Design an enzyme around this catalytic site. Structure first.
Site, PDB file in Angstrom:
ATOM      1  N   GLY A  87       0.821  -1.201   0.000  1.00  0.00           N
ATOM      2  CA  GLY A  87       0.000   0.000   0.000  1.00  0.00           C
ATOM      3  C   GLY A  87       0.856   1.252   0.000  1.00  0.00           C
ATOM      4  N   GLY A 116       4.346   0.661   1.795  1.00  0.00           N
ATOM      5  CA  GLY A 116       5.064  -0.393   1.087  1.00  0.00           C
ATOM      6  C   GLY A 116       5.661   0.051  -0.234  1.00  0.00           C
ATOM      7  CB  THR A 138       1.291  -3.725  11.083  1.00  0.00           C
ATOM      8  OG1 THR A 138       1.718  -4.209   9.804  1.00  0.00           O
ATOM      9  CG2 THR A 138      -0.214  -3.912  11.223  1.00  0.00           C
ATOM     10  CG  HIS A 143       4.180   4.846  17.409  1.00  0.00           C
ATOM     11  ND1 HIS A 143       4.830   6.039  17.184  1.00  0.00           N
ATOM     12  CD2 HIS A 143       3.344   4.670  16.358  1.00  0.00           C
ATOM     13  CE1 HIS A 143       4.399   6.568  16.052  1.00  0.00           C
ATOM     14  NE2 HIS A 143       3.498   5.756  15.531  1.00  0.00           N
TER      15      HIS A 143
HETATM   16  C1  A3D Z   1       4.250   3.035  13.475  1.00  0.00           C
HETATM   17  C2  A3D Z   1       4.061   4.238  12.602  1.00  0.00           C
HETATM   18  O1  A3D Z   1       4.646   5.277  12.826  1.00  0.00           O
HETATM   19  C3  A3D Z   1       3.151   4.182  11.413  1.00  0.00           C
HETATM   20  C4  A3D Z   1       3.059   5.270  10.557  1.00  0.00           C
HETATM   21  C5  A3D Z   1       2.215   5.195   9.459  1.00  0.00           C
HETATM   22  C6  A3D Z   1       1.479   4.038   9.243  1.00  0.00           C
HETATM   23  N1  A3D Z   1       1.583   2.997  10.082  1.00  0.00           N
HETATM   24  C7  A3D Z   1       0.816   1.773   9.861  1.00  0.00           C
HETATM   25  O2  A3D Z   1       1.315   1.044   8.739  1.00  0.00           O
HETATM   26  C8  A3D Z   1       0.250   0.257   8.192  1.00  0.00           C
HETATM   27  C9  A3D Z   1       0.197   0.433   6.679  1.00  0.00           C
HETATM   28  O3  A3D Z   1      -0.148   1.766   6.316  1.00  0.00           O
HETATM   29  P1  A3D Z   1      -0.487   2.093   4.780  1.00  0.00           P
HETATM   30  O4  A3D Z   1       0.608   1.500   3.937  1.00  0.00           O
HETATM   31  O5  A3D Z   1      -0.811   3.554   4.650  1.00  0.00           O
HETATM   32  O6  A3D Z   1      -1.851   1.246   4.589  1.00  0.00           O
HETATM   33  P2  A3D Z   1      -2.519   0.868   3.167  1.00  0.00           P
HETATM   34  O7  A3D Z   1      -2.167   1.887   2.118  1.00  0.00           O
HETATM   35  O8  A3D Z   1      -3.968   0.565   3.446  1.00  0.00           O
HETATM   36  O9  A3D Z   1      -1.784  -0.508   2.803  1.00  0.00           O
HETATM   37  C10 A3D Z   1      -2.049  -1.724   3.491  1.00  0.00           C
HETATM   38  C11 A3D Z   1      -1.773  -2.864   2.523  1.00  0.00           C
HETATM   39  O10 A3D Z   1      -1.773  -4.110   3.222  1.00  0.00           O
HETATM   40  C12 A3D Z   1      -2.364  -5.082   2.364  1.00  0.00           C
HETATM   41  N2  A3D Z   1      -2.859  -6.254   3.116  1.00  0.00           N
HETATM   42  C13 A3D Z   1      -4.027  -6.390   3.772  1.00  0.00           C
HETATM   43  N3  A3D Z   1      -4.109  -7.622   4.334  1.00  0.00           N
HETATM   44  C14 A3D Z   1      -2.982  -8.286   4.030  1.00  0.00           C
HETATM   45  C15 A3D Z   1      -2.420  -9.623   4.304  1.00  0.00           C
HETATM   46  N4  A3D Z   1      -3.107 -10.532   5.038  1.00  0.00           N
HETATM   47  N5  A3D Z   1      -1.196  -9.903   3.796  1.00  0.00           N
HETATM   48  C16 A3D Z   1      -0.492  -9.016   3.063  1.00  0.00           C
HETATM   49  N6  A3D Z   1      -0.948  -7.784   2.778  1.00  0.00           N
HETATM   50  C17 A3D Z   1      -2.159  -7.374   3.228  1.00  0.00           C
HETATM   51  C18 A3D Z   1      -3.456  -4.335   1.622  1.00  0.00           C
HETATM   52  O11 A3D Z   1      -3.814  -4.993   0.404  1.00  0.00           O
HETATM   53  C19 A3D Z   1      -2.829  -2.967   1.423  1.00  0.00           C
HETATM   54  O12 A3D Z   1      -2.234  -2.845   0.127  1.00  0.00           O
HETATM   55  C20 A3D Z   1      -1.025   0.700   8.905  1.00  0.00           C
HETATM   56  O13 A3D Z   1      -1.371  -0.253   9.910  1.00  0.00           O
HETATM   57  C21 A3D Z   1      -0.653   2.009   9.562  1.00  0.00           C
HETATM   58  O14 A3D Z   1      -1.389   2.286  10.757  1.00  0.00           O
HETATM   59  C22 A3D Z   1       2.396   3.048  11.147  1.00  0.00           C
END
Ligand code: A3D
Ligand code: A3D
Ligand code: A3D
Ligand code: A3D
Lengths: 317, 317, 317, 317
Positions: free
Chosen positions: C13, C16, C121, C177
């Site tokens: 996403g 990533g 995550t 965090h």
């Molecule tokens: C710790 C910190 O500072 C911080 C900061 C920003 C985001 N995050 C977290 O990082 C995570 C990702 O954020 P994002 O990239 O914006 O989210 P997003 O753009 O929704 O991407 C999530 C991806 O995970 C994929 N996914 C869902 N289920 C599965 C699975 N079982 N196996 C493999 N892939 C899967 C989904 O298809 C999507 O492409 C979230 O939980 C956020 O809360 C943490």
């Protein structure tokens, strides 16, 4: 268990020190500066170490006189040489440097026989062949830095004529690293445009091309005569690092270098300047340029030059 | 209408050549290598030029003996010096280099009076003061490279004890670039942890801290004794480039350097090592460290050494 | 036989894709973008692949839905998450993301059990602990990205007040965090100068410091409320890459991250934000900051916050 | 008095955000992210700002909805567009984006008329022509990003067949950024070796060359069909940055882009994909490739498509 990449620089003079400096700056690997001269590698290593924090690099750079310290080296770059620049020809260093490489070969064979070896010591092509023979390392794991320097000069001179970025000039020098080197004008291009087109457009003349070819061939003396105390060392160092990068990062980069050519350019097993592909297995392939009959003849004369100096070495005192 | 950034390197010896090399590699600016010695700046400039395509840089690097060629230089780095390392103290070069800097000052005053000037020539602090006076350039546009080298050594030695990345060590050396330099142990931190905490935790002793402080003060001799030809030049070159970067990129970076301190550290107009902020207007500010009484006393002794050597220069026929 | 470094990005996403982009740009490693969603990782991988020649990188970037393709990964970065941003608290994603990590743990355990795992995550600290428990990987080889982001924000806000390079601000955020995170004002320094000195000099007030602490704590919502469609992703991606760099290059870098803390900060085995040293063996040490009584109490409250959410997970439906 | 370099990004969507990210990472310039959408440019600017310290960059990145904030911008990159990917052809966005670019043109004309303008908004070639007309900026100061992306894809596909570094492939795509684009196979070289030689050597077939040419033409759909949300944005962003670099650093780089061609390729004043030289004066020259009769015919058909779509825009109420 990932381990730090490790480059051994054999000979810590003008070129050796620059290699360590740049490798450290780029954080490409840890560096071991080897030399038989007391203090020299230690002093350069300490000095370069102080610069690492300035460059934001965590590379370790140490100086040594002990071949045990090059153990586990991924790349070995050989710069060791008898003192004094060549007066007229790189082959003046033949007898002395062949003897140095005998000793270096014993060190490498004992402590890092799986290393990728890049020779810089002159006379380049004959020294590479000599090292491979005495070390017994695979042909594909032993090569010489020359073509990158020669081609970089060739590209630079073309670029300076047209007033363009040299990175956008494609140009190769092949054959032995000497007066017989062959800057292949036929396969030169600037952003895809061949020299033949620039001639028709009136933007370069054949005489200007000939001057650039001559300038490429004599470039080593132009630098050497200005420096007075030695031969070029900034660009040769950088060229060696580019070759080390290609190996360590498995780039499959097209690298003109002195490599063992067996089924190309009409030769059946000789070290000479050719366009290679370099990756994690060393010299992985050789590319065949489209040479004109004239260029094929000039390459033939270069091969004769290489064989001549090689035979002088075979009958050394 | 944007113009290429331009750095003039006055003196194309050990340090000057490395500066040109690194500036070109980073494509920070074009470089003019100036020297009175025939061939040397031209030879190094040509050599370094050949490496530019290898690094993927379009920086131009030229050699000259004409001060007209430093016209329009944004930064001027002065390495010009009489030959031969100092035996015991950097102030041995005082009179010879003072005369050299007179000629450099008139060159800069005439052809690029709006340049940011970074002196490296020893004895550093007095040479910086000398250049400012004879050149007439603003105090904030003239400084000396020293603190970055001294602090980098200090950081490196601390980092080596704890086995951490030196980039994550914060440490300052202040005062004159000499035996009286003050590695301020009170403001040392490693990832936010102060030395006092490391003592309590049993990870370092006061004796080990004292050794690191001493090592920092005598570091120049450790390098020079091993090089057996001159003084350090890889790290000093890199330090000067980091200072040039801060100016050219308007970083507002904290840079320990020999700067004109007029309302800090209990002095009223003296060039000495202090933590500055460097941006597009040169030395834009000076930070006040929280020094202990012992460190204030040591700094006072450093100021005396600077004044002592400065007065010897002022008193001449 | 040197092999290319390999990073697996689990979840392709917002975060990533950025990780793959930057890793590729820096030529740090080859990248495998994994996702369960059809097309997404493939499309991003092809797009990023086209950019590699522009950056001069030879990194390979591929998209996949098959855990077999993460075999031999040196680093695994987990970004996978249920859709939709958190409204008020990161813990809203607890139940769904715990279940995702169960599946990810089975993939990693089967195909790359020796990988260094960096969790992103949310809710970060509890997710890290959950992954370590279910995967069975060594504590030192599993950690969470958080502290680098929190500390970078903290450093940036301090730097913006003083108008200086943020790289010259030393500042740590520790604890979980979440709202209970602890920006440790006591160990903040700007070029070696502590906040207490800046207060005395009249250059910052305690209220301004309090605002910066508050701003650090709520920073995630400030970004999220402006983006509307999700949470921050440029800086979190970059933070993860810095952590991957530390491991792959064996930097011994001081990295604030969620790590298993056993003999520091008054805890006996809990995943929380602390200053670590990261190298080729993963989390190799934890540094002990000098916390004030107030900061120790705030850290205690953060620990309670972490344990509370952890207990909610233990009693999940 | 040197000033920070400044890039304005008009439209802070998929591409705009990536441009800001990369420009900041490289510390190429400060960035102003402009958008009419509330919150979006501010959210991305804040997020990217937090990453600057992680990358060791001092670039400032801000978000805005006020054209007054792009004042003094050295480069303006236009990504502003109506939402939603094209189904079959890029020209589907013609009328909506023409109206958008009218407002952008008046903004640039008012606040930074001396800027170098790089258009990305589709349909590229016609949008570039449209912007130049309404803005009134010099032809040489307005161009479109397309050729770098198309040529990068072409180079990548060639490189993937031969298993070499794409950086060592020279290849140009010319003509309009559409189905009629001309991947000029005649001027393809791999380390100096032309495709005709590779055919003779038995390392590639004409059928494989035809596939690569087709792949290049349809590449945008391959990405878009997998992303399932919009069009490519990692590589297009990177391409625009490379063009901005050429301008800001005065590289004299060969850059295939949509430029005003008036005395080359048998046209007399049209914006289409050609190999240009870009430096500090914008588009400083156009190179003439040695095209075959077939390639000249294909280029003629491309020019017709550009004229056809351009005339449809000219004919409106
Ligand atoms: C710790 C910190 O500072 C911080 C900061 C920003 C985001 N995050 C977290 O990082 C995570 C990702 O954020 P994002 O990239 O914006 O989210 P997003 O753009 O929704 O991407 C999530 C991806 O995970 C994929 N996914 C869902 N289920 C599965 C699975 N079982 N196996 C493999 N892939 C899967 C989904 O298809 C999507 O492409 C979230 O939980 C956020 O809360 C943490
Ligand atoms: C191929 C090419 O393009 C090119 C370009 C420039 C220089 N070179 C050659 O590279 C070599 C080094 O040049 P340089 O660095 O300027 O020379 P220089 O600065 O003299 O350094 C040579 C170093 O080798 C050391 N040395 C001598 N004998 C031994 C030994 N047995 N073992 C280990 N070290 C030893 C010696 O102490 C000295 O520090 C010379 O042979 C040059 O001709 C080649
Ligand atoms: C402050 C600090 O930390 C530090 C560190 C290392 C060296 N240095 C000093 O930096 C200086 C240069 O060191 P180096 O590069 O190793 O020395 P060196 O390699 O001798 O270079 C000095 C150069 O200056 C040239 N020169 C002499 N007179 C003039 C003149 N009138 N105008 C222009 N150029 C001239 C000379 O030809 C030579 O090439 C010395 O004074 C060192 O003491 C300072
Ligand atoms: C030439 C080439 O190779 C190439 C490649 C990829 C994309 N593109 C084009 O680039 C454009 C942008 O792509 P994207 O970033 O993915 O699209 P997207 O993510 O939708 O971003 C477009 C942005 O423009 C903004 N916008 C709309 N109207 C205005 C206005 N009047 N003023 C300022 N901003 C406005 C809008 O809010 C949005 O944030 C599209 O037209 C694509 O077709 C071209």
């Amino acid at each position: 268990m990932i381990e730090r990449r490790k480059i051994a620089v054999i000979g810590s003079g003008q070129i050796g020190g620059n290699i360590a400096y740049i490798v450290g700056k780029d954080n490409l690997a840890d560096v071991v500066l080897f030399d038989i001269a007391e203090g020299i590698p230690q002093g350069k290593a300490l000095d370069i170490t102080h610069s690492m924090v300035m460059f934001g690099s965590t590379s370790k750079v140490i100086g040594t006189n002990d071949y045990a310290d090059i153990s586990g080296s991924d790349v070995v770059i050989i710069t060791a040489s008898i003192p004094g620049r060549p007066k007229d020809d790189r082959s003046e260093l033949l007898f002395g440097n062949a003897r140095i490489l005998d000793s270096v070969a014993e060190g490498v064979k004992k402590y890092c026989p799986n290393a990728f070896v890049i020779c810089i010591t002159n006379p380049l092509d004959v020294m590479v062949s000599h090292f491979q023979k005495v070390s017994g390392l695979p042909h594909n794991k032993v090569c010489g830095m020359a073509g990158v320097l020669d081609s970089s000069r060739f590209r630079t001179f073309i670029a300076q004529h047209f007033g363009v970025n040299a990175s956008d000039v494609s140009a190769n020098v092949i054959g032995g690293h000497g007066d017989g080197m062959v800057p292949a004008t036929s396969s030169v291009s600037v952003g895809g445009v061949p020299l033949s087109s620039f001639i028709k457009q009136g933007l370069i003349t054949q005489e200007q091309i000939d001057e650039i070819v001559c300038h490429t061939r004599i470039a080593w003396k132009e630098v050497a005569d200005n420096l007075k105390t030695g031969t070029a060392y900034f660009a040769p160092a950088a060229a060696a690092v580019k070759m080390a990068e290609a190996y360590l990062k498995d780039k499959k980069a097209v690298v003109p270098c002195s490599a063992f050519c067996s089924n190309h350019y009409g030769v059946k097993g000789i070290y000479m300047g050719v366009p290679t592909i370099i990756g994690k297995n060393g010299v992985e392939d050789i590319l065949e340029l489209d040479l004109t009959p004239l260029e094929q003849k000039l390459l033939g004369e270069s091969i004769n030059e290489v064989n001549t100096i090689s035979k002088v070495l075979d009958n050394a005192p």
